[PDB]
Amino acid sequence: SEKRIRQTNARRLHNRYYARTARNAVKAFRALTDRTEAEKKYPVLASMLDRLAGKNIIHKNKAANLKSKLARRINTL
């Protein structure tokens, strides 16, 4: 019975770390102004979101929504 508790707790910490990292990266990217700098840091954050969706921490549709929003912003500066 403790095996389920331990596995659930370890997985909860593991998921929380990566989800929080991705959320902070998205929040930091949303505040950028320089178009060249935003275009330079967009690929790494897109990679982070797609890797999260692959690891199943978030949904592929959620990653797609976030990437679409950030690409639209980078288009409009």
Partner RNA sequence: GAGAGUUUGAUCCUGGCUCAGGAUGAACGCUAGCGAUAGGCUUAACACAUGCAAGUCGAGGGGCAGCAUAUGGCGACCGGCGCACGGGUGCGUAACGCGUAUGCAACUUGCCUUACAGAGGGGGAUAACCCGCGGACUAAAACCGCAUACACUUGUAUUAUUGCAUGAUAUUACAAGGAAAUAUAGCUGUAAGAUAGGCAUGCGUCCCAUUAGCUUGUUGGUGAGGUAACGGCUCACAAGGCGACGAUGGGUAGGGGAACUGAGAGGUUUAUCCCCCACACUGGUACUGAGACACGGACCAGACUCCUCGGGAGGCAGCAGUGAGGAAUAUUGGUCAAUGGGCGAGAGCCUGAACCAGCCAAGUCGCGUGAAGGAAGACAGUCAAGGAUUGUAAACUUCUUUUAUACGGGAAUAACGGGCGAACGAGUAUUGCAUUGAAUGUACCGUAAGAAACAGCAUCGGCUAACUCUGCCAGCAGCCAUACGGAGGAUGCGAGCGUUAUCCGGAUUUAUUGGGUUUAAAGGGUGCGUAGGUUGUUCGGUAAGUCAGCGGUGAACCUGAGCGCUCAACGUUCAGCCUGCCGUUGAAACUGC
Q: Which residues bind RNA (CB under 7 A)?
A: 1, 3-8, 10-12, 14-16, 18, 26, 42-43, 46-47, 50-51, 53-56, 58-69, 71-72, 75
Shortest Cβ 16–RNA spacing (Å): 6
Q: What does the chain come to in residues?
A: 77
Residue 49 has a CB neighbour count (10 Å cut-off) of 22
Q: Whose Cβ is closer to RNA: residue 24's or residue 68's?
A: 68
Q: Whose Cβ is closer to RNA: residue 16's or residue 35's?
A: 16
Per the CB < 8 A criterion, the answer to whether 52 and 15 are in contact is: no
Q: What is the DSSP letter of 66?
A: H
